[PDB]
Design a protein around this ligand. Structure first.
Ligand SMILES: CCCCCCCCCCCCCCCCCC(=O)OC[C@H](COP(=O)([O-])OCC(O)COP(=O)([O-])OC[C@@H](COC(=O)CCCCCCCCCCCCCCCCC)OC(=O)CCCCCCCCCCCCCCCCC)OC(=O)CCCCCCCCCCCCCCCCC
Ligand SMILES: CCCCCCCCCCCCCCCCCC(=O)OC[C@H](COP(=O)([O-])OCC(O)COP(=O)([O-])OC[C@@H](COC(=O)CCCCCCCCCCCCCCCCC)OC(=O)CCCCCCCCCCCCCCCCC)OC(=O)CCCCCCCCCCCCCCCCC
Ligand SMILES: CCCCCCCCCCCCCCCCC[C@@H](O)O[C@H](CO[C@H](O)CCCCCCCCCCCCCCC)COP(=O)(O)OCC[N+](C)(C)C
Ligand SMILES: CCCCCCCCCCCCCCCCC[C@@H](O)O[C@H](CO[C@H](O)CCCCCCCCCCCCCCC)COP(=O)(O)OCC[N+](C)(C)C
Ligand SMILES: CCCCCCCC/C=C\CCCCCCCC(=O)OC[C@H](COP(=O)(O)OCCN)OC(=O)CCCCCCC/C=C\CCCCCCCC
Ligand SMILES: CCCCCCCC/C=C\CCCCCCCC(=O)O[C@H](COC(=O)CCCCCCC/C=C/CCCCCCCC)COP(=O)(O)OCCN
Lengths: 98, 105, 129, 121, 71, 347, 171, 83, 99
């Protein structure tokens, strides 16, 4: 396992950790999710190209498409949340408590 | 759980994309076609458990083809020893490895 | 060996992810993600994935991050693991990708249905009331 | 015993053909009677929920409930008996094919076995 | 003809690398010169680092990135 | 929304689950999960209010993170073995990340935090769908890759789920949070037998789904979301309160009720594998679930709470919409213990 | 796990073809028409043996055949071939279509001199048969012995002894 | 009969773009199934050699397989030349 | 290499010429003296994103035309375009393209 794959997985772990920190700005949560899918795309593309799995060249595009669709949904949700409060701050969603 | 509709109906919804050695377009081979072919043939019908204990040789060869850890380790050892001898001064690479060879078609 | 250019590319990618993972001033986070996406596209293109790299650079950068920034604006080592032979008179990447219409009928069906449902879901969610 | 991977198994077959060699459950089987009783209880609770005379609101509805319960119970009992028959057949075949793992114990009489005696005091 | 030339060139490069390994590894105690890393005796297509591992940097760059970088 | 749109979205959710269940390719499983995620969001927001929007966005965030972890596990598995078929996981912690993604999808501890919030935010029908149908696909995947799981991690998360559900249900006055913690504890019971017998997992899933359907339909019929709001049901529909109390006793695992069948079997199975301490601890912890079920039963039908004057008008009207399957669900969740050996049908 | 065998540097010595890709493309059609038999033997052996080391002689044979073909061209049709391959070399794509005139000159010259007829469209891509005495490799993949399959039990189904036998149920 | 013609005439006015688009899309859906040249296109795709034709080992029982490209037996491309 | 050199040259020339434009008039001394969040503009961007995704799906068409399975690829391409048209029509009839 070369160092490039390790760097990509480290990048994904950093994006996931930053998503889990939640300083503020749920928009940053969506940004972290998109960084995660970008790292997934890059490493999956590198693995597939390297092993010459010709039919697997389908998979990255599919992934991209689906992930981007998810982003759209998320953005819509964000707007409505903002549409209630005027700002996308995380701490505004304190109505529901365990 | 898993409802094997494809086998019941003979549809082949996604089995064409599962392995490297399954009818690539224009007969383009995978990098590890032979190793995967050998490992699959060895483990067919044996089952996963007996397959895991008994087809270990073919799976190890397949993994070595896929990731090539042993090959890079051997190459790195050779290069490290070559660097040691070239810093000590008892080894000189031939012109072939210096760019002074006669290239062939 | 150009000092392992892929290594520098990966390190810059990780540096960019660290840079906007602190999430400072979400437009600066988005610009860091733009730089990181450019670096990753460069990685894929240098590897040899021209079409998939261009898909990244077009779809990801020009649509998704653009819409992200638009909505935000509304608000406040190597060279060893490679091959030996050639590909023929075509690129294997293009053939495998174009196989989606001849081999991947099921993939096309499910992706198209998912995208249509995504459009419908977006309309219903953004209806408001 | 995970029998999902059993060789020669049709994926979505509720009752395989070889199950037809087993005796079907009798129509007076106690489990079938219990399934009919469950259907009758379902009918009574249905009458009670909708605020109807519990015993004598809908005779057709209660009859339909009982009949459907009996039908499903009969088929379920068939599948149950078939699966248990498969388990026993597999166990017996494995015991037959692996003699070294199931040795014949030497028959020993209590007159020649020494068991420790603990008085009750 | 191209296939024959390719096979001959690859084999000749592998022979040169084997000779250099035999010369270099003469003092390493447990080394066996030209030992396969695979259990199978089937021929395995060599990697790019198996042919160009001991060669100079410029032709390594050529063999690795020349086609990608040719515009 | 438009009834046609609602029907289409429900069919899309079910089609995503079926695509997960019938496919043998990891990418198709991920696509089915994506389809289910996409079609589920509007269902949680049928009644538009800030609470439902908050619940939907929390659910979307959790499920998207779970999907990303699932894809990373799939890609690492492909890297260490060029396989796309759903089989033995072939690798170290790639399996750990797969298990974490499936646990977040299911709501197992320590990823349980979103279930009570999403259940409280959404209505009762959305909560019914969320707590019943959304468990089939991840459990199917876990049953498929059960021989790969490390028993230590799975058993740890199962015991954590049981403990957290038991403790968190004690503090709730809202009925939806009670149902969410019950779901967490039941999933904990389900996943502790996956390393040993997947048939027991499926049996527990069937029994739990039946009990949850009966409970949610009873809660919808007597439209109460609070303990005191439920305490007013006896003055109109005492038979509903009696059926609810019987169902709550069944969910507590009391013999001879139906809810005793799974735990019993599970305990039995775990004793075949030389495991005693965990079954003992699981029973003693499910005692807490029983305690808060019994408190709800006290407040529901065993005592008569004060009523209000306007209640008299409700005496003059009858429910226009009637749930057909409610009677059957109650009987199946109450009186199916004697039919226990039917679990050989590999349900 | 074993020592890989490689042929000596002496076994890989052959009189090499030192003509550029333009010359090869200009001569390719007649080369495939005339040198078909050694080329087909080499490619059949190459696809059947799956080993470069087992097909070394055939490479020398195909090199010799190419050298003989070019020697005949040089003796009989050197000049028109020179203009033809120069024209082919000028183009950046090395297209045949720009100087059909030089191709016609070269083709008529070779037809008059050596009686060479140019293959038609779609002929060099045919799948042809090769008459060779080289033995068919019995185990080209060096496969081991496949493990024995499961005992595949068979028999007649009977009712389970004493029912399900789960706890207290008698059926 | 009359209602359909009236609807098309009303759509051809004040909505010509949609009428043209629907007509073009319907024609694109329908025409390929009726044309005789789609099989010609499939055959043309079949005759494009992207790979090396691997020769077959002769055993004396393949009268249909040529030994040389100039042999008469084997697939021909005269029809493509005629096109 | 050549593409990297070309991009570097373009960026460097643009940067240098912008800097000289921004600094030439800075050597001589002179005086040196909200919320609304329209919702339609968000729908435009979301629709663009979805249609761009479907275009990404449509992109491999030039190579898809040489597969020997022409009927299947034609069916799938027409299916994709039909669903793109259906998405457009659904968003049209739901008053999603209004101002
Ligand atoms: C061990 C196995 C063997 C035994 C099996 C045990 C289970 C069997 C039955 C299962 C369920 C089916 C029936 C239940 C439906 C409910 C309907 C109801 O309430 O009854 C009203 C109805 C009479 O009232 P009505 O005039 O119709 O109208 C009044 C309204 O209905 C209602 O009037 P109201 O609303 O004004 O009154 C209010 C009242 C009314 O509320 C209720 O009564 C609710 C009903 C109980 C809940 C049922 C839950 C589901 C079943 C679970 C069973 C648990 C068993 C396990 C052990 C745990 C014990 C909890 O509620 C309250 O007072 C609130 C507080 C209640 C106190 C605490 C609650 C505890 C209840 C638990 C009962 C468990 C045993 C039930 C036995 C049957 C009871 C009817 O009763 C009946 O007439 C039906 C009884 C059965 C019919 C028998 C006919 C057969 C005879 C002819 C055939 C011969 C047979 C042999 C053949 C060969 C011979 C020749
Ligand atoms: C009626 C019209 C049709 C008809 O007459 O069919 C003739 C048909 C002719 O049977 P047969 O083959 O000539 O009799 C052979 C012997 O019975 C010998 O048969 P076997 O021993 O081979 O088969 C019995 C076997 C197989 O039986 C079963 O798996 C089902 C067990 C219940 C059967 C009940 C059938 C009728 C249900 C009526 C309502 C019950 C409430 O039972 C067991 O293996 C052990 C089951 C122990 C009970 C399960 C443990 C939980 C008990 C508490 C449950 C709580 C529920 C929630 C509250 O028998 C019936 O259908 C009538 C009922 C027969 C009862 C058999 C079970 C006796 C042992 C358990 C006693 C439970 C008594 C409960 C009250 C029962 C009052 C009726
Ligand atoms: C909670 C009480 C249980 C009630 C459950 C609902 C009852 C209504 C269901 C109506 C009929 C459903 C049957 C479906 C028709 C055909 C099914 C067939 O095609 O599937 C077979 C399988 O059949 C079904 O699984 C059997 C379902 C029967 C469930 C009954 C068991 C209930 C547990 C005991 C409690 C007693 C309940 C009695 C009252 C109903 C093949 O399965 P297979 O592709 O090879 O492997 C997948 C399953 N694996 C992975 C677990 C091995
Ligand atoms: C049988 C079940 C029918 C009812 C249940 C429907 C379940 C959900 C609906 C989706 C299932 C539709 C079946 C499609 C499965 C794909 C495989 C099958 O179709 O064969 C293909 C045949 O392709 C056909 O053209 C498929 C055309 C059907 C798809 C067009 C419309 C699909 C719409 C279905 C629902 C989508 C959303 C709703 C729209 C209204 C493969 O082509 P083929 O050439 O053999 O092999 C290629 C491999 N080669 C290259 C090696 C040779
Ligand atoms: C399509 C073709 C495009 C061609 C590209 C463009 C070519 C650019 C050519 C540049 C022409 C030279 C511009 C010089 C004029 C500078 C502006 C100017 O006159 O400033 C006067 C200013 C007055 O200041 P004060 O009197 O002290 O204070 C009074 C206010 N309180 O005096 C200055 O600062 C002088 C600046 C130094 C200029 C000396 C050299 C002449 C300029 C050459 C350009 C140098 C860079 C090249
Ligand atoms: C399955 C076939 C698909 C292939 C062809 C289509 C491909 C692309 C075309 C469709 C793209 C999406 C179109 C969306 C349609 C929406 C229609 C709509 O709702 O708009 C109505 C108007 O639409 C209509 O008029 C209803 C239907 C009109 C006719 C539509 C075509 C029906 C058939 C006509 C041609 C038939 C075949 C061709 C033969 C013609 C002779 C050659 C209102 O217009 P407004 O803009 O809101 O005006 C308000 C401001 N004044």
């Amino acid at each position: 396992m070369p160092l490039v794959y390790m760097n990509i997985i480290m990048a994904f772990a950093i994006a996931l950790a930053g998503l889990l920190m939640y300083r503020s700005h749920l928009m940053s949560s969506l940004l972290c999710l998109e960084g995660m899918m970008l790292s997934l795309f890059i490493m999956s593309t590198l693995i597939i190209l390297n092993t010459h799995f010709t039919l697997a060249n389908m998979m990255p595009i599919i992934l991209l498409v689906f992930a981007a669709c998810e982003a759209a949904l998320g953005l819509s949700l964000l707007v409505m949340v903002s549409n209630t409060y005027g700002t996308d701050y995380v701490q505004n969603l304190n109505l529901l408590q365990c | 759980p898993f409802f094997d509709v494809q086998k019941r109906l003979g549809l082949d919804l996604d089995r064409w994309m599962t392995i490297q050695s399954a009818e690539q377009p224009h007969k383009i081979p995978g990098r590890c076609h032979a190793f995967e072919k050998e490992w699959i043939e060895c483990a067919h019908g044996i089952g996963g458990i007996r397959a895991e204990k008994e087809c270990k040789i073919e799976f190890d060869d397949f993994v070595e083809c896929l990731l090539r850890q042993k090959t890079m380790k051997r190459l790195s050892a050779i290069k490290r020893q070559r660097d040691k001898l070239i810093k000590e001064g008892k080894y000189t690479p031939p012109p072939h490895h210096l760019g002074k060879e006669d290239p062939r078609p | 060996m150009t000092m392992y250019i892929a290594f520098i590319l990966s390190t810059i990618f990780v540096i960019g992810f660290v840079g906007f993972s602190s999430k400072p001033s979400p437009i600066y986070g988005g610009l860091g993600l733009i730089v990181s996406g450019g670096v990753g596209c460069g990685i894929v293109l240098n590897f040899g994935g021209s079409f998939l790299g261009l898909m990244v650079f077009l779809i990801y950068l020009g649509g998704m991050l653009v819409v992200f920034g638009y909505t935000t604006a509304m608000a406040t080592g190597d060279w060893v693991i490679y091959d030996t032979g050639d590909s023929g008179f075509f690129s294997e990447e293009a053939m495998g990708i174009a196989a989606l219409y001849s081999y991947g009928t099921w993939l096309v069906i499910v992706t198209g249905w998912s995208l249509l449902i995504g459009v419908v879901v977006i309309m219903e969610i953004t209806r408001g009331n | 015993t995970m029998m999902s991977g059993r060789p020669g198994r049709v994926p979505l077959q509720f009752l395989p053909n070889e199950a037809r060699s087993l005796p079907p459950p009798k129509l007076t089987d106690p489990r079938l009677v219990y399934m009919g009783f469950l259907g009758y209880c379902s009918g009574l609770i249905d009458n009670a929920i909708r605020r109807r005379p519990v015993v004598s609101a809908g005779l057709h509805r209660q009859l339909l409930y009982v009949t459907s319960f009996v039908f499903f119970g009969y088929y379920l009992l068939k599948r149950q008996d078939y699966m248990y028959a498969l388990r026993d057949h597999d166990m017996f075949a494995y015991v037959k094919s692996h003699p070294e793992d199931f040795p014949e114990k030497d028959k020993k009489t209590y007159g020649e076995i020494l068991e420790e005696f603990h008085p009750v005091r | 003809l191209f296939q024959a030339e390719k096979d001959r060139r690859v084999l000749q490069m592998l022979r040169e690398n084997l000779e250099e390994e035999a010369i270099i590894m003469k003092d390493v105690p447990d080394w066996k010169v030209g030992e396969s890393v695979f259990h199978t005796t089937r021929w395995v297509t060599p990697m790019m680092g198996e042919l160009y591992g001991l060669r100079t940097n410029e032709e390594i760059l050529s063999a690795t990135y020349g086609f990608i970088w040719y515009t | 929304m438009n009834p046609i749109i609602y029907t289409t979205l429900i069919m899309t959710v079910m089609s995503g689950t079926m695509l997960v269940m019938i496919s043998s390719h990891w990418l198709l499983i991920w696509i089915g999960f994506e389809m289910n995620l996409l079609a589920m969001i509007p269902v949680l927001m049928k009644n538009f209010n800030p609470r439902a929007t908050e619940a939907a966005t929390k659910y979307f965030l959790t499920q998207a993170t779970a999907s990303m972890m699932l894809m990373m596990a799939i890609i690492i598995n492909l890297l260490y073995s060029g396989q796309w078929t759903i089989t033995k996981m072939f690798n170290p912690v790639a399996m750990t990340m797969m298990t974490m993604a499936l646990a977040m999808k299911l709501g197992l501890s320590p990823f349980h935090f979103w279930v009570p919030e999403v259940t409280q935010g959404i209505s009762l029908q959305a909560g019914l769908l969320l707590l019943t149908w959304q468990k089939l696909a991840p459990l199917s995947v876990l049953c498929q890759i059960s021989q790969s799981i490390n028993p230590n991690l799975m058993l740890t998360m199962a015991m954590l789920s049981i403990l957290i559900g038991g403790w968190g249900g004690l503090n709730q006055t809202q009925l939806r949070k009670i149902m969410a913690y019950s779901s967490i504890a039941h999933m904990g019971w389900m996943t502790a037998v996956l390393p040993y017998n997947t048939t027991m997992t499926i049996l527990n899933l069937l029994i739990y789904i039946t009990m949850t359907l009966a409970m949610f339909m009873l809660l919808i019929h007597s439209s109460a979301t609070t303990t005191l709001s439920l305490s007013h049901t006896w003055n109109k529909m005492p038979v509903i309160t009696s059926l609810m109390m019987v169902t709550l006793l069944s969910m507590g695992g009391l013999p001879p009720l139906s809810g005793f069948m799974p735990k019993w079997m599970i305990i039995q199975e775990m004793t075949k594998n030389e495991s005693i301490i965990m079954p003992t601890l699981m029973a003693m912890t499910a005692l807490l679930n029983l305690y808060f079920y019994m408190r709800l039963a006290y407040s529901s039908s065993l005592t008569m709470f004060p009523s209000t004057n306007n209640m008299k008008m409700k005496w003059q009207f009858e429910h226009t919409k009637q749930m057909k399957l409610l009677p059957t669900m109650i009987v199946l969740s109450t009186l199916v213990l004697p039919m226990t050996p039917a679990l050989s049908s590999l349900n | 796990p074993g020592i890989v065998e490689l042929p000596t540097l002496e076994d890989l010595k052959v009189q090499e073809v030192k003509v550029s890709s333009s010359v090869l493309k200009a001569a390719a059609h007649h080369y495939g028409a005339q040198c078909d038999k050694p080329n087909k033997e080499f490619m059949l052996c190459r696809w059947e043996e799956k080993d470069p080391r087992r097909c070394l002689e055939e490479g020398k044979l195909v090199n010799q055949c190419a050298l003989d073909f070019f020697r005949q061209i040089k003796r009989h049709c050197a000049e028109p071939f020179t203009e033809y391959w120069t024209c082919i070399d000028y183009s950046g794509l090395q297209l045949f279509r720009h100087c059909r005139k030089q191709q016609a000159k070269f083709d008529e010259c070779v037809l008059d001199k050596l009686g060479w007829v140019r293959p038609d469209l779609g002929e060099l891509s045919k799948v042809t048969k090769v008459k060779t005495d080289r033995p068919l490799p019995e185990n080209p993949y060096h496969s081991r012995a496949r493990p024995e399959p499961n005992p595949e039990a068979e028999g007649d189904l009977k009712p389970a002894k004493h029912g399900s036998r789960l706890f207290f149920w008698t059926m | 009969a009359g209602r359909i013609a009236s609807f098309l005439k009303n759509a051809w006015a004040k909505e010509p773009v949609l009428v043209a688009s629907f007509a073009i899309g319907g024609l694109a859906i329908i025409l390929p199934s009726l044309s005789p040249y789609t099989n010609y296109a499939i055959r043309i795709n079949r005759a494009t050699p992207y790979n090396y034709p691997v020769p077959l080992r002769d055993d004396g029982n393949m009268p249909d397989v040529p030994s040389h490209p100039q042999d008469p037996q084997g697939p021909s491309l005269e029809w493509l030349k005629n096109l | 290499m050549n593409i990297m050199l070309t991009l570097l040259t373009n960026v460097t020339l643009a940067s240098l010429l912008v800097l000289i434009a921004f600094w030439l008039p800075q050597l001589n001394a002179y005086s040196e003296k909200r919320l609304p969040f329209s919702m339609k503009f968000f729908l435009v961007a979301i629709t663009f994103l979805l249609f761009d995704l479907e275009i990404a799906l449509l992109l491999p068409l030039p190579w898809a035309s040489q597969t020997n399975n022409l009927k299947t690829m034609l069916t799938m391409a027409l299916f994709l375009l039909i669903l793109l048209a259906a998405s457009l029509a659904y968003e049209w009839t739901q008053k999603g393209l209004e101002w």
